[PDB]
Design a protein around this ligand. Structure first.
Ligand SMILES: [Co+2]
Ligand SMILES: [Co+2]
Lengths: 666, 664
């Protein structure tokens, strides 16, 4: 065989050899044409085919690569599939009216283009920067997002322009007032948005943050603190076999791609020999970061970072014991560059276990707590950190010893900033965080995609709302007015599922298997989503934000499963106006399809609303986001009780250590 | 002849001061048979403390508050002792209240019920022979409130259970009936017996020690390889008595019988400018209302802080089990009924822990070679207390961005009641094991903040995210994306009575309207970021809502006055909830000014618990958290002078290794 070796596991990411085999296949299919590679990634097996292979002795699913290419002089993109075993293109089509994810190469070209463009140079000079100082001009290359002057007819970026007095400066204290529009493929500026009110470059010092800058600003650094050292002298408790993790009865596959970053698959829990599925797949599937200044051209700040840049493409190499402290297992990521050659991000994913405080404790007051049992918790963390120009997103998938799974996010990095004139008011749409610096209001919203398989196939979802009894105070049914219950609304059709978090009921959502019954409680096994960082989408209905991110206007969206329903703002996000039946809008359809007791997909919108303050500048302290999926009625008792306690003494042990009798303590 | 004065006016009473106070009170009431219920610091007046600390003012008097009972007299007496003069300076009799139930008060009840003929008869009817009363247990609760007796007797209710062996966890085997006990007479006065009898479960106990687990599931997991934490050069915090200094914070760590940990006089040293933040912060009350309407379960709504005391209930933490790493402990001291000091060793744990990343940024232009990373450390001041079945693990956390957070972990055992073989537990509870009904309930807490944000004269506000009122396609909001934060400053008490609202992602600011941040133009603040804010589910006019007037709003802001600590009143057990006391008194008619003055901010937070079998027989920790974050307090990130874990500038990276981007 001329073909690449098969992977250890059908969900493993393409290897570097597979990537090059796929791009050689595609270049040969398009021989004589000038093409460049935008995406070369695993096309995961169909859900049915994977489960049949894994659990039913079924066929080996074909090993497939999905590609996206551009061709010089042709609009839009072509996409397709390569069958790796046969080195052949098996599906292909041209999409002339979309634009694809912006890769690191696509973006890294823009600053050159603007520094050399005569119209940009003229605007720099009008803004107070001499023409021979263009090396001091920088830009963060953004997708244009959407601009109704061009649609998808050209592939465009917008350059958010800044100035550095010295290369070691943090540029964000010195935005310029104007916004060049760049044709990515022609490498040319095609327009510059210039405000009606000109604001020249700030004359203030840069707002810097390295130690040499801090010594100048505040006089000295704090002395190094005494260390806190973490060691695991007998190694770790988890076991990896390729990308497959085993830890504390969990087993799952750790995948990775250019767009979602980490993808956790085939998640099960070994309940005393009974290996019980939980999720087929869980990942972040899209984001949107909509800014809240209505002034032109700031409507074009609403990056969909996952679909427009890629949480894999943006991911940082983590080594070593700075980002991830302790004893660490790393994974690398592999992509294609534009030439079709593999590229590697070393140490893209960090895996480790950490102390997580107490798992459970109880002591008996009767012998003054001599009867006591204490068990400490350990958590497993699978992490990446990606950089979207100014911001850093730190992602932590956390498994815990009560069977819960949590996603923790920490936001850090730098505020997006725009220039503020000397006498200009930033509010109500932003904050003056430093002289002449306006940090606009914004949200950070994420779409968690869960493909559940709670205790096996055939699942449903529900909203669970705490409610007082409807019977009044002083009735026979509620004499003292204290009765309350959980109202469970099972979603029958897609439209039923379109629901928001509600503080008035402390709403949670269940994902459950209606085919099974817990023998104690009589309720179906479930994982419960406990999530309260669930902002409303503030942009209004019919806005460009709401149209491009149809998923973001509800906290929960549940649709039928179909293969290839990954990305809820569509497969090719940049420059889509938000008009059309694609992504989540397609999957919702008329709202009528069944989602009760079937294969479903559960997409959860969560995140934060950010009103900047000076504490966030020039570099932002981490701000946390979290959500939890908790087993409820899944087990018949606390699943962690077979973990050896940290301390345990029974009543009979404590007695030995020292009419009817009362309490020992009486 | 007086006790030594303490190092600091807010230090808790020493054992010597406790005994000096109870000797003074016994001499004042000479010839009378009295018992001690509470003997605790009466903290200095806020004005007197601040004057002493900051203005060279008078040393405040060192005072003890006491509560006593007298044999044959109703209610309590309470008063103050001036320690320097060994004299009672204030005293009064309150004949129609009942006070906190101490460990001694509660320790007695199981003896009483085991020996009571009517209880023995009910045990026999329930399937337990009369000569097996040593296998009958009860958790002694306050009666909470029962309209048959008011405050006219001091009462407990006994939640009764059965153990087949003393090492069992009893909660799989509740009995069906509820004795009512006169605490001071040590007698059963009544037994609530259900119309439907349910005899004791015949199932095995639902046990959780390793010997039980080996029998149940065959084997324990092997010991996991260790994770070891060491600080070979010591810790970065410094204590001087109860005064903590860490990462520019300075504060006093106090403790009492009722609130447990009390953090006082909290400041941040902003590059030599020592800026107040809070005068006092603590948990001031709780309520844990159950949601079964059936009699007598309406009496399960413990106000654990006011009825038992988070100090009285607190565990000795000794252990590198409860608190892992390099730990500083504090002891707690109280009085017993005889007036002798008692000690709980290792009541408070103090330590620092890694807390992940503080901040990071890298420049894509040189593929992240330009990078700065700084790791975070947190300071944790913790206690764990046991309220019979439940464990409450409390963690006050200071962080290096200037934020303060309170983290709680709930663990221990569900309250359980018996369920008949054919009885449905829902909708008010869950069958978590055969014949075991775990009723629905909430756990609610009242955080009390006495702020001094950047000094004296503070206000509070609700902050609501809102879309612009201008429509999509208007000149003012062409693309429909505009949004802002609507700040509603509370002018009078009534304005402050507000709930968390998911629809606006509501936060609350506590701010100083006399000052202005020179960059943003906004007042310095600490913002309460808190979303675990349940509605009170019990109806208006219910026992629960009347006894916990603070619990029906997420936020209550009132004027400061001295001695406004406890929002369900000073003597909680057996109060019906009728009357103008506690938070109801402090709210008054709602009209008093709370803008730019001395205020108190009481925040209700917690969870609503629908039990599931995972919670049984022993519950995995369930988290609750809230944060108070500086916003417009500093002019830049305050942590930037912490040494990075890693830093490389662009010029350094170039050395190590018009033009475009380096990576182009
Ligand atoms: Co932000
Ligand atoms: Co509970």
């Amino acid at each position: 065989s001329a073909a690449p070796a098969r992977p250890a596991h059908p969900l493993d990411p393409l290897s570097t050899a597979e990537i090059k085999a796929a791009t050689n296949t595609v270049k040969s299919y398009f021989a004589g044409k000038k093409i460049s590679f935008n995406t070369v990634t695993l096309r995961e097996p169909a859900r049915k085919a994977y489960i049949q292979w894994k659990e039913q002795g079924g066929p080996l699913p074909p090993r497939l690569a999905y590609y996206v290419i551009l061709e010089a002089g042709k609009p839009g993109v072509k996409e397709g599939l390569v069958d790796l075993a046969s080195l052949s293109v098996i599906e292909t089509r041209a999409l002339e009216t979309v634009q694809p994810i912006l890769t690191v190469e696509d973006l890294c070209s823009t600053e050159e283009v603007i520094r050399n463009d005569p119209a940009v140079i003229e605007q720099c000079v009008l803004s107070g920067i001499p023409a021979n100082e263009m090396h001091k001009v920088y830009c963060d290359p953004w997708t244009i997002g959407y601009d109704e002057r061009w649609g998808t007819g050209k592939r465009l970026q917008q350059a958010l322009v800044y100035y550095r007095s010295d290369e070691d400066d943090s540029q964000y204290s010195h935005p310029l007032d104007f916004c060049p529009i760049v044709d990515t493929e022609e490498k040319k500026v095609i327009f510059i948005d210039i405000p009606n009110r000109r604001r020249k470059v700030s004359k203030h010092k840069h707002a810097n943050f390295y130690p040499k800058h801090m010594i100048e600003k505040v006089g000295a650094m704090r002395p190094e603190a005494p260390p806190i050292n973490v060691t695991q002298p007998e190694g770790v408790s988890f076991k990896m076999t390729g990308n497959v993790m085993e830890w504390s009865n969990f087993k799952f596959h750790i995948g990775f791609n250019y767009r979602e970053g980490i993808v956790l698959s085939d998640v099960s829990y070994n309940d005393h020999g009974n290996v019980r599925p939980i999720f087929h797949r869980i990942s972040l599937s899209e984001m949107i970061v909509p800014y809240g200044s209505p002034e032109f051209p700031h409507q074009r700040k609403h990056a969909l970072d996952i679909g427009e840049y890629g949480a894999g493409y943006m991911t940082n190499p983590l080594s070593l014991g700075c980002d991830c402290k302790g004893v660490i297992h790393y994974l690398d990521a592999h992509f294609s560059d534009r030439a079709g050659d593999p590229i590697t991000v070393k140490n893209a994913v960090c895996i480790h276990e950490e102390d997580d405080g107490l798992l459970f404790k109880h002591s008996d007051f009767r012998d003054n707590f001599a009867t006591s049992l204490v068990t400490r918790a350990t958590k497993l963390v699978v992490s990446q950190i990606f950089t979207a120009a100014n911001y850093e997103y730190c992602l932590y998938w956390v498994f815990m010893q009560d069977g819960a799974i949590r996603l923790d996010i920490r936001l850090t990095g730098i505020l997006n900033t725009y220039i503020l004139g000397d006498d200009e008011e930033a509010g109500p749409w932003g904050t003056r965080v430093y002289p002449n610096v306006n940090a606009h209001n914004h949200q950070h919203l994420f779409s968690l995609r869960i493909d559940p398989r709670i205790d096996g196939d055939g699942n449903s979802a529900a909203a669970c709302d705490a409610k007082s009894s409807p019977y009044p105070l002083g009735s026979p049914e509620n004499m003292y007015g204290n009765a309350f219950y959980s109202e469970k609304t099972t979603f029958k059709t897609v439209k039923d599922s379109l629901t928001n978090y509600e503080s008035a009921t402390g709403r949670s959502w269940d994902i459950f298997n209606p085919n099974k019954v817990n023998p104690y409680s009589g309720k179906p096994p479930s994982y419960k989503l406990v999530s309260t960082q669930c902002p409303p989408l503030l942009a209004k209905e019919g806005s460009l934000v709401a149209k491009r991110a149809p998923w973001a206007s509800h906290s929960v969206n549940v649709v039928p499963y179909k293969d290839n329903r990954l990305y809820p703002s569509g497969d090719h996000v940049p420059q889509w106006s938000g008009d059309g039946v694609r992504g989540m809008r397609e999957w919702i359809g008329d709202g009528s399809e069944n989602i009760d007791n079937t294969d479903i997909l559960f997409f959860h919108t969560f995140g934060i609303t950010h009103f900047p303050a000076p504490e966030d500048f020039p570099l932002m302290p981490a701000e946390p986001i979290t959500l939890m999926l908790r087993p409820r009625h899944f087990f018949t008792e606390n699943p962690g009780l077979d973990i050896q306690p940290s301390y345990a003494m029974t009543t009979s042990e404590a007695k030995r250590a020292v009419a009817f009798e009362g309490s020992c303590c009486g």
